[PDB]
Amino acid sequence: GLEEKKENKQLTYTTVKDIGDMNPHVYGGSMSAESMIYEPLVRNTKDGIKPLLAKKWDVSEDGKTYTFHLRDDVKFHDGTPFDADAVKKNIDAVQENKKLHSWLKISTLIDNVKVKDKYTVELNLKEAYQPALAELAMPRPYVFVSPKDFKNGTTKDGVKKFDGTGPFKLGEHKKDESADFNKNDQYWGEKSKLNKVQAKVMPAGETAFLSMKKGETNFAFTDDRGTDSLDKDSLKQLKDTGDYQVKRSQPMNTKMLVVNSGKKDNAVSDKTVRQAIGHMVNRDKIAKEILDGQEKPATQLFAKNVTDINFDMPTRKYDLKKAESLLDEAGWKKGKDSDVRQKDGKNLEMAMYYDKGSSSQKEQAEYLQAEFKKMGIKLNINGETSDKIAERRTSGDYDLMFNQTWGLLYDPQSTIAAFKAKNGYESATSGIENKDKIYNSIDDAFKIQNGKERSDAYKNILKQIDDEGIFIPISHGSMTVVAPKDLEKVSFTQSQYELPFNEMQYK
Numbered sequence: 001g002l003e004e005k006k007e008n009k010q011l012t013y014t015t016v017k018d019i020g021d022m023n024p025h026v027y028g029g030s031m032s033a034e035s036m037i038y039e040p041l042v043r044n045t046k047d048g049i050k051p052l053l054a055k056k057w058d059v060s061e062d063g064k065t066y067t068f069h070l071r072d073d074v075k076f077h078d079g080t081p082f083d084a085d086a087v088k089k090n091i092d093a094v095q096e097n098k099k100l101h102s103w104l105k106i107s108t109l110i111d112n113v114k115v116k117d118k119y120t121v122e123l124n125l126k127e128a129y130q131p132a133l134a135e136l137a138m139p140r141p142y143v144f145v146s147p148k149d150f151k152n153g154t155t156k157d158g159v160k161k162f163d164g165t166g167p168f169k170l171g172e173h174k175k176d177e178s179a180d181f182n183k184n185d186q187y188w189g190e191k192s193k194l195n196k197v198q199a200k201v202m203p204a205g206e207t208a209f210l211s212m213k214k215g216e217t218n219f220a221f222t223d224d225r226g227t228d229s230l231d232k233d234s235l236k237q238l239k240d241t242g243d244y245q246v247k248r249s250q251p252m253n254t255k256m257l258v259v260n261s262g263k264k265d266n267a268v269s270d271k272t273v274r275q276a277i278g279h280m281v282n283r284d285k286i287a288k289e290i291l292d293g294q295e296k297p298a299t300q301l302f303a304k305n306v307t308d309i310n311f312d313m314p315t316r317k318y319d320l321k322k323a324e325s326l327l328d329e330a331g332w333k334k335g336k337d338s339d340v341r342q343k344d345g346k347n348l349e350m351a352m353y354y355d356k357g358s359s360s361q362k363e364q365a366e367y368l369q370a371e372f373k374k375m376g377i378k379l380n381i382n383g384e385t386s387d388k389i390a391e392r393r394t395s396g397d398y399d400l401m402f403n404q405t406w407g408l409l410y411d412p413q414s415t416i417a418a419f420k421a422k423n424g425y426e427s428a429t430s431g432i433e434n435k436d437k438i439y440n441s442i443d444d445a446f447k448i449q450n451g452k453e454r455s456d457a458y459k460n461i462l463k464q465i466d467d468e469g470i471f472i473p474i475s476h477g478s479m480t481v482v483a484p485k486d487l488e489k490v491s492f493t494q495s496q497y498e499l500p501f502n503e504m505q506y507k
């Protein structure tokens with residue numbers, strides 16, 4: 001129960017998905033799990049870049065050479081040392097697979113790494129690049145795995161064990177059931193007060209709620225795909241027990257519909273149909289009624305207050321006459337016979353995908369399905385695992401899906417770069433006729449030093465992307481955490497993908 005977990009210094013969180021592949025040089029694994037065990041050279045905080053595995057660093061005059069002075073007291077979880085050599089091998093191993101990392105521009109600029117002495121490592125770039133430190137602070141890919149865990153000096157095809165430097169170590173993992181993160185008693189920095197944090201896999205909804213009420217789990221938080229295992233009324237019922245508190249971060253992302261311009265066998269490949277769909281999403285009512293006012297509606301992909309945006313570019317409004325008139329233009333007309341829309345003898349249908357673990361995504365899917373039926377479209381909705389949603393996002397096998405932007409450290413520049421990445425939203429943009437010009441504009445934008453000129457370059461990109469109807473913004477997501485009422489020091493970083501497990505502490 002709760003008491004015993006308090007007494008034993010344990011947290012056990014409920015989640016709908018397993019930790020996956022804990023090699024942090026690739027992206028399949030749980031993000032928060034990996035940030036408990038692996039560490040970057042530096043951290044990107046609300047106060048800027050701060051030391052972590054590197055204590056200090058020098059940038060050359062020309063901006064091409066970063067020299068990192070490493071901590072000398074760090075060990076990997078297997079007992080092997082952390083040093084310049086380990087840094088160079090990790091970065092070389094990531095760079096050996098740089099096609100996977102091309103969403104992050106530094107991976108295209110890294111020339112070589114050199115070891116200067118035992119705790120001094122030089123990183124040489126092809127050109128100067130001021131976001132370098134920021135990109136090195138990300139949770140993947142530039143975090144450090146024991147080189148003894150490499151497979152013949154590589155990580156691109158996996159690692160043999162999952163030894164990092166972080167405040168927790170990976171312990172017993174039973175596939176689709178539980179994973180243990182045990183306190184790293186040799187940790188170099190702020191040691192965990194908790195002995196163990198356990199990720200316990202179970203379906204969302206009633207199972208998760210009961211698990212929590214009885215203290216079999218005693219913690220929850222929005223996973224890395226944005227899914228909250230507990231709905232608003234579960235949260236109410238848990239606060240009401242007296243045992244639990246509920247914290248919610250500042251708004252971190254935009255939650256949107258993705259509309260696959262590249263799906264050639266379906267109507268969503270027609271710009272006009274995409275524009276029509278855009279007027280069929282009542283974001284105001286969804287925010288107020290379906291999401292219980294817990295999120296504000298989103299009228300553009302990246303909110304005005306996001307870095308380098310600072311513009312209002314309101315998207316298509318909810319307007320069914322406008323939708324009708326656009327579907328008629330596209331030749332998807334109803335009939336006196338029926339209210340159902342047809343073209344060339346075929347009915348208008350589309351397949352929408354949502355995470356079956358998200359009650360909010362499911363309710364939205366049901367709503368929209370009802371709303372699309374009024375328009376004479378048959379919207380087939382499919383709840384799947386977030387792992388399956390992601391695979392579909394990469395393959396392009398979908399007409400519409402729920403998704404979300406990547407948060408405060410990624411929006412807008414990384415999320416925009418992902419518009420032309422295979423592992424991001426390239427599927428959805430791949431059917432735009434001016435895609436060659438937009439993709440080139442994306443590359444150009446990142447080279448613009450002046451803030452205002454850059455914001456304008458982003459505006460020109462986003463305007464065309466809005467024109468295309470690729471993304472339909474809906475609401476602004478936060479990170480939500482349920483925790484024991486006597487757990488102190490639960491707080492949020494800039495990321496929606498980690499939590500300070502090693503700082504949390506009972507009573």
Ligand SMILES: C[C@H](N[C@@H](CCN[C@H](Cc1c[nH]cn1)C(=O)O)C(=O)O)C(=O)O
Binds near residue numbers: 027028424
């Ligand atoms: C590289 C790219 N995305 C980044 C940041 C964005 N993460 C989210 C959330 C996520 C969860 N699991 C994998 N990505 C996303 O791609 O929507 C990363 O995974 O480190 C990717 O997933 O391949």
Ligand SMILES: [Cl-]
Binds near residue numbers: 298299301302303
């Ligand atoms: Cl907005």
Ligand SMILES: [Zn+2]
Binds near residue numbers: 027
């Ligand atoms: Zn990702």
